[model samples]
Target chain A: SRYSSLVPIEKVGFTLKNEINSRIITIKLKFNGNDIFGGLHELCDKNLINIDKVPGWLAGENGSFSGTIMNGDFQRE
Target chain B: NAMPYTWKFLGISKQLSLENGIAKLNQLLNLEVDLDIQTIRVPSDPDGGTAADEYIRYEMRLDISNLDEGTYSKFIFLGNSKMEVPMFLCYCGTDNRNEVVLQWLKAEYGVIMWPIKFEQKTMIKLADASIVHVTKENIEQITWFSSKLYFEPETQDKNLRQFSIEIPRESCEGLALGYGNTMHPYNDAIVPYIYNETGMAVERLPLTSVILAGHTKIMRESIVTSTRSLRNRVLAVVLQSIQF
Candidate 1:
């Protein structure tokens, strides 16, 4: 319910990779090669959002902003 | 129960009594203190009456010369209406000389001595045997008589990563009395920019202080609790981030 906003999703340039779990929705992000982590850094700076608060807001319109973003990108590949 | 008045320093907890607490705190710092007492009068009735209430006040000033040089001073006051008090810790000339003063109170004694205004200067030795002069400053543009902090944790990692810092109502009165402006650092372009980038939120606490003096003791306790919780949250996140 908290994830109904598309403003932040499009702002970050993320594309869904898989829906393995409703809670842990695997996702892929596209960005300029020169700016890999730059998107995240800017996302935080622009929105004044915490690094930990970014993942939850990324999991589509139904995602939970309170949820954590685990480091398993390697598993998706 | 009335929360059992208590004070803690350097992992040591003691019952809170103005006189005893000051004595124990001085001993904990290993610094001798000079105390001075004075009396003040306050009107009792709503209508200004000739009869007034007399109150005794105590001020504790610390001697920190042997500890460090360059205008080292600290003060703690007690007693008055509701027995509220203020404290100060100061130093000059860096080179980790004040690190002991800062770390001991913050880390060791769990004392949160907010910076009022101070400048530090020192030289550092590099691996190449070079010297570099460094200057650090935390100048307080406004005097915040009381303040509070709130922390919010992100759900997924159980990591409390967000925090808010605020000044109580009386601070506004003090601010109005001294400076004509509103909210500091915000008024400064550089500081607000840095905070924007760092994801740090700076704003005033919505709550008002109906009785400023009565909230003094509780405010100190709240600060200690919030600071400790922040440390724990950081530790948990750091440890959990490690991949097994």
Candidate 2:
């Protein structure tokens, strides 16, 4: 059977990595949108992984830019 | 008295062999479940990669679907009446370091198996025995996640109005913050709901908890309470034979 609607689960999580040269640290956040109902609610040790990524409206602008900050996106020092 | 998924995939449904079971699992989800489920001896390394005499392990094909990319992002394949066994899910997240992946076998402490593909900052481990003591109080906080799925009964003979409605995914997220997508844990893993034999329809359900690290004995009523709350309404719909 085909589903009439395909809903999305929007939430964000980040991986904190440090720079090898300067040793300065930056965060690389990845949006984990849509998972099994009860699968995503668990959190990390410190409250660091708090910001829950809310779902973006398909028609909205800038809502499309996934907030993924790869290694290149962070500052060197 | 059941066959493995590999057989179903090969159009061969004789024994429950790894070859057969994995075959079907592959077809359904399009991923290679190279491993089979196995139970190891107690005191085994929660790390899982090693530990001589440690029983081999079998991964949950159905729940593992949570990790599949193309398949329906949110779907569940229930056990047919033939043969259904308990599923163990161990999850972990990784830091930039290669060794950061969480290991369940040698965990500092906590229940180690849970939702398929369920990832976390900590590691999870499961064996026959309780190895360490993290102490209940030190558990500090708990996280959990829950949702309502709209499904229609699968039928071959009759096709009546098999329709159902549920609280949309975002709607559920609104009810709780962790609900949106990350991990949500509460005082122990639990959900509230009511159900009976007629078919298993549930009612008066509350929020649900996602198990990060922990286990429960048969008499552990806490597990029952937590699971029920998240499933009441959904179970009510699935087991509609009984009136809630």
Best by TM-score: 1
Question: Measured with DockQ on alpha carbons, how good is candidate 1?
Answer: 0.05
| DockQ for every prediction shown | 0.05, 0.02
Error (Å) of candidate 1 at residue B82 is 9.1
> For all candidates listed, what's the TM-score of chain B alone?
0.26, 0.20
TM-score on alpha carbons, each prediction: 0.25, 0.18
For lDDT, the strongest prediction is 1
Where in model 1 is the C-alpha error above 4 Å?
Answer: A1-77, B1-33, B41-54, B66-77, B80-156, B165-244
A32 Cα displacement, candidate 2 (Å): 31
Q: Give the C-alpha miss distance for residue B87 in model 1, angstroms.
A: 16
* Candidate 2, lDDT over the whole model: 0.23
